[PDB]
Design a binder for this molecule. Structure first.
Ligand SMILES: *[C@@H]1O[C@H](CO)[C@@H](O)[C@H](O)[C@H]1NC(C)=O
Ligand SMILES: *[C@@H]1O[C@H](CO)[C@@H](O)[C@H](O)[C@H]1NC(C)=O
Lengths: 148, 148, 284
């Protein structure tokens, strides 16, 4: 079963026999989705400071649509919005649906300040017309000063 | 194998110069093509492209002064963009010397591409392009040097 | 370091730290570095004023690797030396790399004081190492005026029924521990209305913290105030207790009269009781 990613997968193989070594031509397996969401996911995200955490929703569907994106964070990363409803784990972003033009994209921003050492799992749920899907992203943090 | 923090870039940015290395005719006029494509093979619809120019003495030198002029900002349309940059105005007083004879050394150009439709960023660069008074070079291939 | 909208200006105001065995005079030659966020540049014509000046506090200035380099001869031990400059920023980025403000003596590069800063406004603030905050939003609230005659009894129901407003109850402040920066506000619960999930009971004597930056929300010790605000934050450094109150911006705080009555007049207290009974009987 193919892994879930927007990028094109390049599979490659080599073979060994008494005849000799043979490298097969690289097979490009393209994995695409009509309506999907992806985010920057910065590396190491220093602790104590708030981050912009920008992401973009893509619509390849010819017809227009309205999208809703909510964020759920494990304990703990300080959020500037709140509250958590209905479930204690589920974090409502109180998302207002914005119009996304056909063959266009829209911007999504989340201001969050991590309070503890990573890596912590942070979910971004996407509620939209033409189906809905949620991706799981991990956020890692690092202490302020460094001396080895 | 390289050990680094890769971040795993979202889209590919390829920089194709019309000519490999700048000659006499290309000093007054130099055109360069900037083309950025997603990893799912679908070209970037619309994005903002910022170009940075600079001059370097050698390849080993990581740091050198630069203009101070532009910083020309053009928008990537349908996965392709192009811009013309002349050396005559470029170097001048900014590089403290102006001539093709005065400065014989590499030219480094930086490109920063951001998506206008949604948050993402990718960067690329050209290690260098040297202005040479003596074009090309000469070499022999598949020609053993012997006489019959 | 601080960034205000009042083109945007950036100030430094840094000083030298005296040593017990060292008489305070000034500091040795030190390089002052300011890291500009990716896609942000500063105006050189505005920076030239430091060099051009008859009185020279700075020998040279430079821009290297997207950083601002300016060398200072002596750092004042008495007061903080300020540096002001205007910036020109062009859109972007995917993610802004944390901007650092650092200063180091040119003699020893070994030890460098570094502090992070952000040009954008701070939504989340006040994160304590001891009590493990648990923000505490940055925005500032305001307290209603003392003995505001009527105007209005109906408006209180609208404010309390707000989905964002969770705890609306009558409390009496007991003890106050000033800063840094907490303002604990030890109180006592006389009565509850909502009192929605997950908290409970009565006479629990709970506390709510507020940053000292708000002088308008100052409470008088011993005077009972009716407080309606956001849901209580969970826990602390202590794994038990477990429900401390935020006291954030746009919280309803109004003085509840105890003493006479008629204070010109007692009729105001009836307007407060109507809101209590209406929200208790029917509610949101
Ligand atoms: C993301 O959704 C998954 C589904 O398995 C779940 O395991 C996890 O609780 C989620 N993470 C958060 C922070 O809500
Ligand atoms: C929690 O904090 C208090 C101070 O408010 C401290 O004195 C006490 O030890 C703690 N309570 C418990 C039950 O551990």
């Amino acid at each position: 079963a193919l892994p879930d990613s927007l990028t094109t997968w390049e599979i490659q193989g080599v073979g060994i026999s008494n005849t000799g070594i043979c490298v097969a031509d690289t097979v490009k397996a393209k994995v695409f989705k009509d309506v999907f969401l992806e985010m920057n996911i910065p590396y190491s995200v220093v602790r104590g400071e708030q981050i912009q955490l920008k992401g973009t929703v893509y619509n390849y569907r010819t017809s227009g649509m309205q999208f809703c994106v909510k964020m759920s964070a494990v304990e703990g990363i300080c959020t500037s919005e709140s509250p958590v409803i209905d479930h204690q784990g589920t974090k409502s972003s109180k998302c207002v649906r914005q119009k996304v033009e056909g063959s266009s994209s829209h911007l999504v921003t989340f201001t969050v300040l991590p309070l503890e050492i990573g890596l912590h799992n942070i979910n971004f749920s996407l509620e939209t017309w033409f189906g809905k899907e949620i991706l799981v992203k991990t956020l890692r943090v690092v202490p302020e000063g460094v001396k080895r | 194998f390289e050990v680094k923090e890769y971040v795993l870039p979202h889209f590919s940015v390829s920089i194709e110069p019309e000519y490999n290395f700048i000659g006499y005719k290309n000093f007054k006029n130099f055109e360069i093509t900037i083309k950025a494509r997603y990893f799912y093979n679908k070209v970037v619809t619309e994005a903002d492209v910022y170009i940075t120019f600079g001059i370097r003495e050698d390849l080993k030198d990581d740091q050198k002064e630069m203009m101070q002029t532009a910083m020309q900002n053009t928008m990537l349309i349908n996965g392709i963009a192009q811009v013309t940059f002349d050396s005559e105005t470029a170097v001048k007083e900014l590089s403290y010397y102006s001539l093709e004879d005065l400065n014989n050394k590499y030219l480094y150009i930086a490109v920063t591409v951001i998506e206008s439709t949604g948050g993402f960023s990718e960067e690329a660069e050209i290690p260098g392009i040297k202005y040479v008074l003596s074009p090309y070079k000469l070499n022999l291939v598949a020609t053993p040097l012997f006489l019959k | 370091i601080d960034t205000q909208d009042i083109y945007k200006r950036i100030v430094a105001c840094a000083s030298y730290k005296p040593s017990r065995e060292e008489s305070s005079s000034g500091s040795s030659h030190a390089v002052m570095d300011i890291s500009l966020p990716t896609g942000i540049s500063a105006n050189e014509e505005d920076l030239k004023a430091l060099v051009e000046g008859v009185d020279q506090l700075f020998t040279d200035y430079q821009i290297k690797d997207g950083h601002v380099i300016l060398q200072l001869n002596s750092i004042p031990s008495s007061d903080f030396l300020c540096v002001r400059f205007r910036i020109f920023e062009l859109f972007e980025v995917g993610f802004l790399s944390p901007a650092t403000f650092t200063v180091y003596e040119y003699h020893r590069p070994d030890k460098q004081c570094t502090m992070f800063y952000s040009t954008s406004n701070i939504k989340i603030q006040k994160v304590c190492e001891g009590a493990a905050c648990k923000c505490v939003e940055a925005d500032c609230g305001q307290m209603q005026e003392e003995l505001d005659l009527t105007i209005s009894a109906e408006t209180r129901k609208q404010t309390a029924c707000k989905p964002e407003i969770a705890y609306a109850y009558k409390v009496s402040i007991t003890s106050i521990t000033v800063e840094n920066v907490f303002v604990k506000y030890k109180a006592t619960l006389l009565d509850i209305y909502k009192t929605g999930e997950a908290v409970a009971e009565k006479d629990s004597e709970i506390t709510f913290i507020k940053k000292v930056t708000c002088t308008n929300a100052e409470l008088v010790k011993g005077r009972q105030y009716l407080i309606m605000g956001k849901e209580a934050l969970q826990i602390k450094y202590n794994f038990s207790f477990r429900y401390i109150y935020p006291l954030d911006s746009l919280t309803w705080i109004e003085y509840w009269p105890r003493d006479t009555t008629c204070s010109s007049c007692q009729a105001f207290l009836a307007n407060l009781d109507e809101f209590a009974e209406d929200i208790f009987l029917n509610g949101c």
